[PDB]
Write a protein that holds these residues in place. Structure first.
Motif, short mmCIF file in Angstrom:
data_model
loop_
_atom_site.label_atom_id
_atom_site.label_comp_id
_atom_site.label_asym_id
_atom_site.label_seq_id
_atom_site.Cartn_x
_atom_site.Cartn_y
_atom_site.Cartn_z
N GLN A 141 0.93 -1.79 0.09
CA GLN A 141 0.45 -0.20 0.02
C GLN A 141 0.63 1.35 0.36
N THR A 142 0.61 1.99 -0.86
CA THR A 142 1.16 3.36 -1.05
C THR A 142 0.24 4.60 -0.82
N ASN A 143 0.32 5.88 -1.25
CA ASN A 143 -0.50 7.12 -1.26
C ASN A 143 -0.64 7.22 -2.54
N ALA A 144 -0.72 6.24 -3.44
CA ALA A 144 -0.82 6.45 -5.01
C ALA A 144 -1.92 5.08 -5.23
N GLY A 145 -1.70 3.94 -4.10
CA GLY A 145 -2.80 3.03 -3.80
C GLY A 145 -1.77 1.62 -4.09
N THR A 146 -2.82 0.73 -4.31
CA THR A 146 -2.16 -0.64 -4.12
C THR A 146 -0.72 -1.11 -5.09
N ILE A 147 0.25 -1.30 -5.55
CA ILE A 147 1.73 -1.95 -5.76
C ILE A 147 1.91 -3.42 -5.14
N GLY A 148 2.71 -4.33 -6.99
CA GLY A 148 2.60 -5.50 -6.66
C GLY A 148 4.42 -4.52 -6.36
N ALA A 149 5.54 -5.43 -5.95
CA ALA A 149 6.51 -4.65 -5.78
C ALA A 149 8.21 -5.85 -5.15
N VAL A 150 9.08 -5.64 -5.75
CA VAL A 150 10.14 -6.73 -5.45
C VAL A 150 10.96 -6.03 -3.65
N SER A 151 11.47 -6.42 -3.35
CA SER A 151 11.82 -6.60 -2.09
C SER A 151 13.77 -6.81 -2.24
N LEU A 152 14.32 -6.52 -3.63
CA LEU A 152 15.15 -6.45 -4.10
C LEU A 152 16.01 -5.26 -4.46
N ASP A 153 16.97 -4.31 -4.21
CA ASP A 153 18.00 -3.12 -4.16
C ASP A 153 18.50 -3.85 -4.91
N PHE A 154 18.56 -3.28 -6.30
CA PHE A 154 20.13 -3.15 -7.09
C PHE A 154 19.91 -1.87 -6.78
N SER A 155 21.40 -1.44 -7.78
CA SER A 155 22.40 -0.71 -8.07
C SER A 155 21.57 0.54 -9.15
N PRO A 156 21.60 1.71 -8.64
CA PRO A 156 20.47 3.18 -9.05
C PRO A 156 20.11 3.10 -10.47
N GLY A 157 20.92 3.02 -11.66
CA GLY A 157 20.42 2.75 -13.22
C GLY A 157 20.18 1.04 -14.19
N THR A 158 19.67 0.47 -12.42
CA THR A 158 19.32 -1.04 -13.12
C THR A 158 17.89 -0.74 -13.98
N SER A 159 16.88 0.86 -12.95
CA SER A 159 15.09 0.86 -12.61
C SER A 159 15.03 0.43 -15.13
N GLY A 160 13.72 -0.49 -14.94
CA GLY A 160 13.38 -0.54 -16.42
C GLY A 160 14.25 -2.14 -16.59
N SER A 161 14.98 -2.85 -15.51
CA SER A 161 14.93 -4.64 -16.01
C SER A 161 13.82 -4.61 -16.29
N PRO A 162 13.66 -6.22 -16.81
CA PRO A 162 12.91 -6.49 -16.72
C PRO A 162 12.28 -6.84 -16.13
N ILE A 163 10.92 -7.96 -14.96
CA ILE A 163 10.25 -8.31 -14.45
C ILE A 163 9.63 -9.57 -15.39
N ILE A 164 10.26 -11.48 -14.93
CA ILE A 164 9.48 -12.08 -15.93
C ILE A 164 8.67 -13.49 -15.07
N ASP A 165 7.79 -13.58 -15.52
CA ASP A 165 7.60 -15.17 -14.97
C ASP A 165 7.53 -15.82 -15.72
N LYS A 166 7.25 -17.45 -15.38
CA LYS A 166 7.37 -18.50 -15.94
C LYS A 166 7.43 -18.84 -16.94
N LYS A 167 6.05 -18.41 -17.67
CA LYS A 167 5.74 -17.89 -19.13
C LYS A 167 6.91 -17.22 -20.16
N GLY A 168 8.17 -16.22 -19.45
CA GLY A 168 8.58 -15.45 -20.27
C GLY A 168 8.30 -14.51 -20.53
N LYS A 169 6.35 -13.98 -19.52
CA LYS A 169 6.61 -12.99 -19.94
C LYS A 169 6.79 -11.54 -18.96
N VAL A 170 6.65 -10.48 -19.19
CA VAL A 170 7.22 -8.99 -18.72
C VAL A 170 5.68 -9.28 -17.73
#
Length: 196
Positions: free
Chosen positions: A142-171
């Motif tokens: 829950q955010t001030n925007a509403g409900t989000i999906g989210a992951v607890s992985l903190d990558f280095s700064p310029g990783t934003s935009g990396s795709p997140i894939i399900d087991k069928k290979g969908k983004v």
């Protein structure tokens, strides 16, 4: 600004990350003879890095996904700039600044839809690191925007935009910005909108 696309990896699920948690994504270039491995340690469908041209050379600022004639990345990465691949211009076609999304060459093509409880892989493109599939269980927050999906992985700064894939290979979306949720969890949002 002077923004370049560099293809980094196929958009596919990595079996080894299921076994292991993590797995490098190694790509082989055939050269004019020898095979070699791509080694980003040194400075059209797929995952790409977005590099700005410096005086010192190219610096990665983000990442994105090519699918179905369309490049997909984060608004805050390009901020609407024209992108270059190998001297061709690619001009933005659609943006939702509040979702933090921008597509180029068409509307939104990404169609994965994460289901709560199910594991995903971040195909992470950290600056100056080879691609890594990282297997993770995202959460509903829950955010001030509403409900989000989210992951607890903190990558280095310029990783934003990396795709997140399900087991069928969908983004299922893109590795978005850091937010503190209601609850105080510091998480990265799954940035997604509907296919148009």
């Amino acid at each position: 600004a002077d923004l370049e696309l560099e293809r980094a990896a196929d958009v596919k699920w990595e079996d080894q990350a299921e076994i292991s948690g993590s797995s490098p994504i190694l790509s082989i270039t055939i050269s004019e003879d020898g095979s070699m491995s791509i080694k980003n340690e040194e400075e059209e469908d797929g995952a790409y890095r977005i590099k700005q041209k410096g005086i010192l050379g190219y610096s990665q600022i983000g990442a994105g996904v090519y699918k179905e004639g369309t490049f997909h990345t984060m608004w805050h990465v390009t901020r609407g700039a024209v992108l270059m691949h190998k001297g061709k211009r690619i001009e933005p076609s659609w943006a939702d600044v509040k979702k933090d999304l921008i597509s180029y060459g068409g509307g939104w093509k990404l169609e994965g839809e994460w289901k709560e409880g199910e594991e995903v892989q971040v195909l992470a493109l950290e600056p100056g690191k080879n691609p890594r599939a990282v297997q993770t269980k995202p959460g509903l927050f829950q955010t001030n925007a509403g409900t989000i999906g989210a992951v607890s992985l903190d990558f280095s700064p310029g990783t934003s935009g990396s795709p997140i894939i399900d087991k069928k290979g969908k983004v299922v979306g893109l590795y978005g910005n850091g937010v503190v949720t209601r609850s105080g969890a510091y998480v990265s949002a799954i940035a997604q909108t509907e296919k148009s």
